[PDB]
Design an enzyme around this catalytic site. Structure first.
Site, PDB file in Angstrom:
ATOM      1  N   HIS A  59       0.769  -1.242   0.000  1.00 16.95           N
ATOM      2  CA  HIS A  59       0.000   0.000   0.000  1.00 16.95           C
ATOM      3  C   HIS A  59       0.802   1.295   0.000  1.00 16.95           C
ATOM      4  O   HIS A  59       0.209   2.362   0.110  1.00 16.95           O
ATOM      5  CB  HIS A  59      -0.957   0.027   1.194  1.00 16.95           C
ATOM      6  N   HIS A  99      -2.108  -1.905   8.574  1.00 17.36           N
ATOM      7  CA  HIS A  99      -3.372  -2.177   7.913  1.00 17.36           C
ATOM      8  C   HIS A  99      -3.885  -0.922   7.239  1.00 17.36           C
ATOM      9  O   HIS A  99      -3.941   0.130   7.863  1.00 17.36           O
ATOM     10  CB  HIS A  99      -4.395  -2.707   8.925  1.00 17.36           C
TER      11      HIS A  99
END
Lengths: 109, 458
Positions: free
Chosen positions: A10, A105
């Protein structure tokens, strides 16, 4: 999920001629699309990882950047014969989940 | 089975002695793939030798390498010297200058059946030169990919002339080029005039509106060979969709794959789409992702999918404004339709109640769903016992995607217990971006060892 998994999946900005090429290639480079798999949705954030680390919250904590950052949103359009993506580039709110003082996350847009 | 050696490398650093080592192999290879291996123009002189001497080399795939124009001129030094069938040079930093080289090539090899040169700024002038090669009688090309090549409306007369001279063409992609309606109408006339038994036509994100959908319709009605039409990311709307359905519903049309994602379709389009779903036995796969079909639209399609003529095997309706309200309708289809094998219905606020309802239909004996995608559907831990029972009961369900749902550690643990049960024939359980503690991270690792025939993806 770990801190370096978060970075790998990410955080990126790598230059590509268009968003499709960006998504198609980077999903493979970052070890997500391997062994025939095509992840349907994935977002890459283009910033100093410091902005996301910055530095110690209760864990499972969800924290959001102040400055909205440049991000690329990859969206699967076709899986066969091979992964094919479109996408949208977005100045966006980056929401993360914390563990051990670290973002591990991606929770938010 | 074995058909010649297959050299396949991706995303690696290639080192010169390894390159040396790999050369001897490439002389043997039936296919060579070096994808995103940071190849530069200097490596292409080697490959050019291989192309000429290797009687068995049939595929050459060098996407995502900066060969540049100089690279392709080197690489094709050997291709001007005679049996390559497939050449992929997608995203290789080619400009219009490469197209003269590729013109020569296409004019040289009757063996070449596939050329992929998408993601290169060839531009209209460049692809015009390319078409000159396509027009050669020697050229027997079957598949041509020109997506994201910065083509403009002005390309179409050259392409039409090339198509007339390509009866061997089976696949054409012009997606992601700003052509517009006037050009696409001209292209449709060119395809209809061409003798090619075209099988695939991809025109996604090409500036198409309802204004050229009558013309696309005429392609569908004049090319019985056309199996695969993609016009997603074109704002055709309900009006253009209705015009397209005149061709889809034509008795000559034998469409199998229909891609209509992000086409600005509303629930009103589902009337016409229902008529297609219940009339066209050949239709197998449809993507309607990112259209605001809403519950009412989905419900129309579901009523159509109960007709016995409905042979649809795959339906993607991710991000279609769907809620639990439509799930009873969808469940009914799973109950009675035996042909539907794949359903993607993620990015819909179905909630726990919606998904529990789907699981009712899934359990029916004649439900042949083997892959169900439910990512980002607002489901939580409370739904996972239900999903679990499906996983251990439904033997023919081998793929389930629950990614981007806040299932919590409790929910994922429930899924794991199902995976441990020997009656469970799940093959890929997909759980991307779900926040769990390290105790689940450890349990998944342990479960990889207990049941290796069940892949848990995260």
């Amino acid at each position: 999920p770990t801190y370096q998994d978060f970075l790998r999946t990410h955080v990126d900005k790598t230059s590509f001629p268009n968003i499709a090429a960006y998504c198609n290639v980077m999903m493979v480079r970052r070890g997500i699309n391997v062994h025939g798999r095509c992840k349907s949705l994935n977002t890459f954030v283009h910033t100093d990882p410091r902005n996301l680390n910055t530095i110690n919250q209760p864990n499972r904590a969800l924290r959001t950047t102040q400055q909205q950052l440049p991000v690329t949103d990859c969206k699967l359009i076709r899986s066969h014969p091979t992964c094919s993506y479109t996408g949208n580039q977005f100045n966006h709110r980056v929401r993360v989940g914390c563990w051990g003082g670290l973002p591990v996350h991606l929770d938010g847009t | 089975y074995f058909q010649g050696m297959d050299l396949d490398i991706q995303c690696e650093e290639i080192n010169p002695s390894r390159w040396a080592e790999l050369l001897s192999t490439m002389k043997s290879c039936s296919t060579i793939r070096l994808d995103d291996c940071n190849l530069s123009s200097s490596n292409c002189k080697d490959l050019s030798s291989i192309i000429h001497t290797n009687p068995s080399l049939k595929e050459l795939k060098l996407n995502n390498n900066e060969l540049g124009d100089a690279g392709i001129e080197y690489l094709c030094k050997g291709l001007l010297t005679p049996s390559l069938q497939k050449l992929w040079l997608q995203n290789c930093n080619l400009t219009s200058a490469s197209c003269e080289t590729l013109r020569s090539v296409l004019s040289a090899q009757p063996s070449l059946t596939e050329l992929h040169v998408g993601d290169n700024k060839l531009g209209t002038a460049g692809v015009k030169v390319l078409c000159q090669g396509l027009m050669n009688p020697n050229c027997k090309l079957q598949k041509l990919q020109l997506e994201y090549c910065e083509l403009t409306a002005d390309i179409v007369e050259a392409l039409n002339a090339a198509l007339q001279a390509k009866p061997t063409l089976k696949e054409l992609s012009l997606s992601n080029n700003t052509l517009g309606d006037t050009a696409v109408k001209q292209l449709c006339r060119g395809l209809v005039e061409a003798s090619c038994d075209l099988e695939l036509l991809h025109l996604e994100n090409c500036g198409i509106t309802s204004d050229s959908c009558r013309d696309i319709s005429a392609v569908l009605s004049s090319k019985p060979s056309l199996l695969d039409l993609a016009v997603g990311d074109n704002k055709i709307g309900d009006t253009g969709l209705a015009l397209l359905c005149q061709g889809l519903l034509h008795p000559n049309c034998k469409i199998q794959k229909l891609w209509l994602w992000d086409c600005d379709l509303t629930s009103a389009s589902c009337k016409d789409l229902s008529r297609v779903f219940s009339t066209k036995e050949t239709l197998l796969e449809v993507s309607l992702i990112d259209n605001n079909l809403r519950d009412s639209g989905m419900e129309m399609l579901c009523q159509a999918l109960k007709d016995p003529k409905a042979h649809l095997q795959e339906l993607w309706v991710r991000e279609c404004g769907l809620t639990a309200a439509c799930c009873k309708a969808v469940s009914s289809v799973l109950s009675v339709n035996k042909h539907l094998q794949v359903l993607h219905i993620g990015e819909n606020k179905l909630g726990n109640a919606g998904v529990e309802i789907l699981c009712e239909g899934l359990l029916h004996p004649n439900c042949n769903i083997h892959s169900l995608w439910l990512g980002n559907c607002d489901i939580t831990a409370a739904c996972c016992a239900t999903l679990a029972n499906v996983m251990v009961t439904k033997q023919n369900l081998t793929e389930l995607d629950l990614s981007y749902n806040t299932l919590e550690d409790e929910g994922v643990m429930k899924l794991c217990e199902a995976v441990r049960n020997p009656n469970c024939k799940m093959q890929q359980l997909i759980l991307y971006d779900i926040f769990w503690g390290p105790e689940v991270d450890d349990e998944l690792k342990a479960l990889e060892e207990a049941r290796p025939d069940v892949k848990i993806i995260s």
